[PDB]
Design a protein around this ligand. Structure first.
Ligand SMILES: C#CCO[C@@H]1[C@@H](C)[C@H](OC(=O)NCCCNC(=N)NC(=O)NC)[C@@H](C)C(=O)O[C@H](CC)[C@@](C)(O)[C@@H]2OC(C)(C)O[C@H]([C@@H]2C)[C@H](C)C[C@@]1(C)O
Ligand SMILES: C#CCO[C@@H]1[C@@H](C)[C@H](OC(=O)NCCCNC(=N)NC(=O)NC)[C@@H](C)C(=O)O[C@H](CC)[C@@](C)(O)[C@@H]2OC(C)(C)O[C@H]([C@@H]2C)[C@H](C)C[C@@]1(C)O
Ligand SMILES: O=[P-]([O-])[O-]
Ligand code: NA
Length: 498
């Protein structure tokens, strides 16, 4: 009965703020007024993006921002709360461009969290910005802290949380308390930077919004779905970096939690979070893309999937060949590698030579252009059925998406998500989740309920034997064991009673 979060990013670049208008699409293509009252009601959160951390190690607007015009844009968002008393307008600090390891502001992230005094100054700036502009909470999208930064980052989230709670009391906002989220890694390689401390990262948050998209891109050897729900045995597999994290676990505990190689999927990332003790399913939000990733130079045979390709990975895009046939936004943005769902529907509708195909393992669509050798991986209202059902079945907090400006004009992706969670007449009880590969790791946070005979002192247990003892089901790792389960290294806790 607790409503699923539906968290949509609203991104607007500094030049568009500084020239804001709602009546000229060539200047601002996605003004706040495209978020109509019906869209407002279907959202729980809008994440306004992006703010940054400056060299004074405070949360700050891009210094080229016209402040009066910024306030105006933010005021138009917050006015939407008139249509939906559950709605929050968050603001987001970071993003890939500012905060990636080679990003323009990267050192400011590292330095802002590094010491107690820096964290106090930074935390205060976040809450000051939030109050000054009328936002409802803070989202941190640092992609990604690593190493010694992680203890600092945790401390900074803890301090923000305390300051938000103070502000909730001050404003009497107990009915809509100020919130703290992060955009979390959605793939094991980046997740491995802070994985061992995941319960400490999540504790101060209302949600961790997993970036379970961009799981494929031009940096990969072969094409792949960027947001596959489940795995396809014909697709690529990857090393499970989490088995090397500083967890202190045994070989058997590692091996049971972290199969390798593994399929890089939404389900993988969600299960990886659930495995960890102290990470509640209700805080885990599944991110979904409202854009496709395009590849060129692909071979025939399986619809462009799992092919070698010739897509440049350099930034900026290195030439003026805008080879994504039918994508006008790509010409405008000078980059054929990403296209909004909005644009993709038009490409598919026009006579551009794409077929829309469906992978019934991954439960995702893809475009194939057989003549030119193009492949596009994206999500639609159909893949959203399976993802919504998964969110309900796994008792997740909800869905996040990047970004609102990429939905079609009628807002059909957002409407679909809202329907699958909230429509009285939508029924997915019979929706078949398929036989794609499930991530089968088990860790301390997601032990299955099991039964077994009670342990008996004196009995010699062979390898593989299962007993119940003190709340759990235990399995011997070798034989013959007579020790009490948990008293030495021979027993593996495999299950929980009752
Ligand atoms: C989030 C994110 C990715 O960041 C994209 C920005 C880095 C764009 O990256 C993507 O959209 N990638 C797909 C989404 C990946 N998502 C994330 N990593 N993180 C995320 O979703 N966080 C919630 C790329 C494709 C892009 O547009 O770069 C532009 C050239 C085409 C930039 C780099 O010039 C870009 O131009 C504009 C469009 C004005 O955006 C600027 C930045 C200056 C911001 C700062 C960067 C973003 C928001 O467009
Ligand atoms: C192709 C290639 C190899 O290049 C990798 C760099 C391109 C890496 O390429 C590979 O290692 N390729 C395949 C092997 C492993 N595959 C994955 N790790 N897949 C995965 O994480 N999927 C989400 C991938 C994993 C990567 O990290 O890409 C990043 C976005 C996800 C980049 C492209 O944004 C990357 O981010 C950082 C981490 C800041 O590194 C940057 C560059 C900006 C350098 C310039 C690129 C390299 C050196 O990290
Ligand atoms: O790049 P185009 O065929 O709009
Ligand atoms: Na056609």
């Amino acid at each position: 009965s607790t409503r699923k979060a539906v968290i949509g990013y609203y991104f607007i670049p500094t030049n568009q703020i500084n020239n804001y208008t709602e009546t000229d699409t060539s200047v601002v293509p996605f003004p706040v007024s495209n978020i109509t009252p019906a869209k407002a009601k279907q959202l729980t959160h809008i994440n306004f993006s992006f703010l940054d951390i400056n060299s004074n190690l405070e949360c700050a607007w891009d210094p080229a921002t016209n402040d009066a015009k910024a306030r105006d844009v933010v005021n138009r968002l917050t006015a939407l709360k008139a249509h939906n008393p559950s709605l929050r307008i968050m603001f987001s600090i970071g993003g890939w461009y500012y905060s990636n390891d080679l990003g323009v502001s990267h050192a400011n992230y590292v330095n802002a969290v590094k010491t107690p005094a820096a964290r106090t100054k930074f935390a205060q700036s976040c809450v000051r910005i939030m109050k000054d502009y009328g936002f409802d909470g803070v989202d941190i999208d640092w992609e990604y802290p690593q190493a010694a930064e992680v203890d600092g980052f945790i401390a900074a989230l803890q301090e923000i949380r305390t300051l938000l709670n103070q502000q909730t009391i001050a404003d009497g906002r107990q009915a809509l308390p100020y919130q703290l989220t992060i955009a979390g890694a959605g793939g094991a390689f980046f997740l491995s930077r802070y994985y061992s401390k995941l319960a400490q990262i999540v504790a101060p948050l209302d949600y961790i919004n997993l970036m379970t998209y961009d799981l494929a891109g031009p940096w990969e050897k072969i094409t792949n779905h960027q947001a596959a729900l489940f795995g396809d045995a014909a697709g690529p597999t990857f090393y499970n970096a989490l088995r090397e994290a500083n967890l202190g676990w045994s070989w058997e505990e590692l091996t049971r939690a972290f199969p390798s190689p593994f399929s890089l999927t939404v389900d993988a990332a969600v299960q990886q979070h659930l495995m960890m003790e102290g990470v509640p399913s209700a805080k885990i939000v599944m991110g979904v893309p409202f854009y496709g990733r395009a590849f060129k130079g692909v071979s025939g045979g399986n619809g462009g999937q799992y092919s070698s390709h010739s897509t440049p990975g350099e930034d900026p895009y290195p030439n003026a060949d805008y080879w994504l046939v039918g994508c006008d936004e790509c010409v405008r943005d000078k980059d054929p590698r990403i296209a909004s769902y909005r644009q993709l529907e038009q490409m598919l509708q026009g006579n551009y030579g794409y077929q829309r195909l469906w992978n019934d393992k991954t439960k995702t669509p893809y475009l194939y252009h057989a003549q030119n050798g193009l492949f596009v991986t994206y999500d639609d209202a159909e893949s959203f059925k399976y993802k919504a059902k998964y969110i309900k079945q796994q008792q997740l907090g909800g869905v996040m998406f990047w970004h609102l400006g990429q939905d079609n004009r009628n807002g059909d992706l957002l409407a679909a998500l809202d329907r699958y969670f909230n429509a009285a007449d939508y029924d997915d009880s019979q929706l078949d989740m398929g036989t794609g590969l499930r991530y089968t790791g088990v860790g301390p946070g997601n032990l299955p309920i099991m039964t077994a005979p009670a342990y008996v002192p004196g009995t010699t247990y062979a390898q593989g034997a299962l007993v119940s003892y003190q709340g759990y089901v235990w399995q011997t790792k070798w034989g013959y064991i007579t020790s009490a389960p948990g008293s030495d290294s021979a027993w593996l806790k495999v299950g929980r009673l009752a």
